[PDB]
Amino acid sequence: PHMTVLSDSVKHPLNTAWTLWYTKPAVDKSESWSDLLRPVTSFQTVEEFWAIIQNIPEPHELPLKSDYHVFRNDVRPEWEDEANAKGGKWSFQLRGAGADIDELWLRTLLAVIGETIDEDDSQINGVVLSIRKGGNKFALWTASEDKEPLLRIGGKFKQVLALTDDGHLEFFPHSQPSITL
Amino acid sequence: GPHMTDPITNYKPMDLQYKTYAYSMNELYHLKPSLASASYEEDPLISELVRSLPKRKFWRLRMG
Numbered sequence: 201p202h203m204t205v206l207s208d209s210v211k212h213p214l215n216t217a218w219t220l221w222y223t224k225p226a227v228d229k230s231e232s233w234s235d236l237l238r239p240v241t242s243f244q245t246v247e248e249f250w251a252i253i254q255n256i257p258e259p260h261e262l263p264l265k266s267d268y269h270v271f272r273n274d275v276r277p278e279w280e281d282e283a284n285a286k287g288g289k290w291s292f293q294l295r296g297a298g299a300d301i302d303e304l305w306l307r308t309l310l311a312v313i314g315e316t317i318d319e320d321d322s323q324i325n326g327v328v329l330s331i332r333k334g335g336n337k338f339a340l341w342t343a344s345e346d347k348e349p350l351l352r353i354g355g356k357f358k359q360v361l362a363l364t365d366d367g368h369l370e371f372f373p374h375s376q377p378s379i380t381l
Numbered sequence: 382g383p384h385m386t387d388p389i390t391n392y393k394p395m396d397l398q399y400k401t402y403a404y405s406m407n408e409l410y411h412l413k414p415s416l417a418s419a420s421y422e423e424d425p426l427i428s429e430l431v432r433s434l435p436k437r438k439f440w441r442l443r444m445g
């Protein structure tokens with residue numbers, strides 16, 4: 201059995217509000233990152249989350265060089281944002297066919313909004329799906345470089361991604377990775 | 382190779398101090414709307430949120 205987004209089968213608050221952002225693919229050589237990154241919508245309940253993800257494109261539909269970002273409200277998905285500037289990202293690159301992208305992304309989002317893999321003293325500020333020619337990437341953006349909290353998060357993220365080998369998860373400070381798991 | 386039977390899907394941290402709201406993956410997946418709650422019985426407030434989302438042109442799906 202597999203989890204799916206679309207319904208081909210008392211509100212429930214989330215710990216924080218979240219905003220979904222998109223990086224558009226450029227149509228020319230003039231558009232900049234600041235032109236391409238746009239906020240989409242915000243949500244703060246499970247019901248709102250499901251309504252959004254059932255009414256936006258699935259990962260397998262997205263074009264090369266686009267991104268989805270889901271970040272806690274008042275945090276931009278940018279290394280320059282105050283909340284991210286002392287942190288980094290755990291990133292996994294799915295090389296190969298990647299037929300599991302939609303389910304991997306759903307599982308990642310559920311684990312992020314559900315607060316299950318973050319530390320209680322929160323590290324995770326957001327999560328990013330990046331569509332790239334050499335393989336799509338999944339990344340958790342953290343507020344710090346604190347090693348033991350990062351290793352706890354990283355080990356849980358590997359389980360969410362159903363990774364069984366080692367060396368697949370790499371931590372890149374927002375300043376070659378500094379940790380590999 | 383993810384599967385719904387993966388034990389991660391039932392995990393949630395307990396005895397939290399900072400956060401009230403945490404949910405396992407399975408708890409969240411159980412809250413997926415039914416077909417009716419996503420259409421002809423959708424909460425009108427949720428309908429307003431869906432209607433505020435961008436039109437399909439926003440995503441530039443044809444830009445390879």
Ligand SMILES: C[n+]1cn([C@@H]2O[C@H](COP(=O)(O)OP(=O)(O)OP(=O)(O)O)[C@@H](O)[C@H]2O)c2nc(N)[nH]c(=O)c21
Nearest residue numbers: 232233234265267277278279280281330332333334337
């Ligand atoms: C996340 N992010 C991306 N960019 C711009 O987007 C570019 C790509 O940023 P990227 O981090 O997505 O790199 P990736 O390795 O996926 O790119 P690839 O080589 O196409 O595979 C960077 O050079 C910046 O120009 C960014 N530019 C700024 N200023 N701040 C950001 O946080 C930021």
